[PDB]
């Protein structure tokens, strides 16, 4: 197998060989350090003074938070933060419920059995991001096409450049409308707070980064999440009670499934000794978030999904100053999807108990390509 250890999974778990990798070891044509222990990953990601983020990494946008470190990163994140406050996330909840129920309506109309990934997992995330950004409902299909299209390598140059011209024109008019009268969306929140200090280029950059950062991780979580819950049916009761129970179940699913294989690679800013290893200035460190969230020190049963467990402080959203800017949105979106899904389809089940599981192996986030369910 040519695939790097950190990208290997076995079912819903990290592959056995990744789970047996030491806390911090060398892996290889580039050679890097691979961190698998929870405390080592926390040390690497939390210490931005010794470990900077590799720039222009792909699992160049202006104001792409992942490219900078404090203080430059701190100023940029500060500027974007207004679009992600907890009070603003609370106000999104009804909109997110409506998006989810509109997709569950299309699935319901198609009839049992149906593919949950095509109807729900692959559609809800981008619609929630459009809602967050401030894109008008009737423009969302077009917006998703323009945004991903201007970055689609499989297209012809002519096609990709035309989509990019349209995307720019669309974004700039949206930005001008928000500056004139700020709305409740992300752009409006940034310009309401910082006005002209937030440049059009920064805003365009913030928009693209967010569209890219909150899509695959969420669709992977919706698909894998439903599959995990169906495999542990008694635990579905956590989505049939109070909000706190549902929130704890979402956090547990996020930890147990850890869809991102790794955060941005980190570069040693100088020589240092970590976990008994000699790290030299310039060395690259890849953090296996899935392995770190299965660290035996975290719990005797860290390898089991248990939505009622004493919560385990996981690294699936990262750690330190770059900790996922959309984490609260993600938790809310996921809780909404699962709560509404089981409210609508109480008898949800795999369409065929013996059906194969179709894993999504081509994306930076683990997930499913299809999931046939009955109800
Ligand atoms: C369950 C889903 C999600 C997971 C597991 C996830 C995971 C992560 C991780 C691991 C990082 C840190 C990367 C690093 O330190 O190198 C990160 C950063 C980030 N995430 Fe997420 N994310 C999710 C959903 C979202 C959503 C929905 C949004 C957008 C609304 C989002 C926006 C971002 C942004 C902008 C950053 C960069 C923050 C910074 O560099 O300061 N994420 N995410």
Swiss-Prot record:
Cofactor(s) annotated in UniProt: heme
Top-level taxon of origin: Bacteria
GO biological process entries: vancomycin biosynthetic process
Xref: Pfam families: p450 (PF00067)
Enzyme kind, highest EC tier: oxidoreductase
Heme is among the record's keywords: yes
Annotated GO MF terms: heme binding; iron ion binding; monooxygenase activity; oxidoreductase activity, acting on paired donors, with incorporation or reduction of molecular oxygen
Keywords: Heme, Iron, Metal-binding, Monooxygenase, Oxidoreductase
Keyword rRNA processing set for record: no
Functional pathway: Antibiotic biosynthesis; vancomycin biosynthesis
EC number: 1.14.-.-
Positions bound to heme: 324
Function: Involved in the coupling of aromatic side chains of the heptapeptide of vancomycin.
Family, similarity comment: Belongs to the cytochrome P450 family.
Protein name as it appears in the record: Cytochrome P450 165B3
């Amino acid at each position: 197998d040519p695939r790097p250890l950190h990208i290997r999974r076995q079912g819903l778990d990290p592959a056995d060989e990744l789970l047996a990798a030491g806390a911090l070891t060398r892996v290889t044509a580039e050679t890097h350090w691979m961190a698998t222990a929870h405390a080592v990953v926390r040390q690497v990601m939390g210490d931005h003074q010794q470990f900077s983020t590799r720039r222009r990494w792909d699992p160049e946008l202006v104001g792409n938070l992942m490219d900078y470190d404090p203080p430059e990163h701190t100023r940029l994140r500060r500027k974007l933060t207004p679009g992600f406050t907890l009070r603003k996330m609370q106000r999104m909840a009804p909109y997110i419920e409506q998006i989810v129920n509109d997709r569950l309506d299309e699935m319901e109309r198609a009839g049992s059995p149906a593919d949950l990934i095509a109807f729900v997992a692959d559609k809800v995330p981008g619609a929630v991001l459009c809602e967050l950004v401030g894109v008008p409902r009737d423009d969302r299909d077009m917006f998703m096409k323009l945004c991903h299209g201007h970055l689609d390598a499989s297209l012809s140059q002519k096609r990709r450049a035309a989509l990019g011209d349209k995307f720019s024109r669309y974004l700039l008019a949206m930005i001008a409308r928000e500056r004139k009268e700020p709305g409740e969306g992300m752009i409006g929140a940034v310009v309401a707070e910082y006005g002209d200090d937030a440049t059009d280029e920064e805003l365009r950059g913030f928009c693209v980064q967010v569209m890219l950062a909150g899509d695959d991780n969420i669709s992977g979580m919706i698909g894998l999440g439903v599959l995990a819950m169906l495999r542990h049916p008694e635990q579905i009761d956590a989505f049939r009670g109070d909000e706190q129970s549902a929130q704890r179940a979402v956090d547990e699913l996020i930890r147990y499934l850890t869809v991102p294989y790794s955060p941005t690679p980190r570069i040693a800013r100088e020589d240092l000794t970590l976990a008994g290893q000699e790290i030299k200035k310039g060395d690259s460190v890849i953090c296996s978030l899935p392995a770190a969230n299965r660290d035996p020190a975290l719990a005797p049963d860290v390898d089991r999904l248990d939505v009622t467990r004493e919560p385990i402080p996981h690294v699936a959203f990262g750690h330190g100053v770059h900790h996922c800017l959309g984490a609260a949105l993600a938790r809310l979106e996921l809780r909404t999807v699962f709560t509404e899904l089981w409210r609508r389809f109480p008898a949800l089940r795999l369409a065929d108990p013996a059906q194969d599981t179709e894993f999504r192996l081509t994306t930076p986030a683990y997930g499913l390509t299809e999931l046939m369910v009955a109800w």
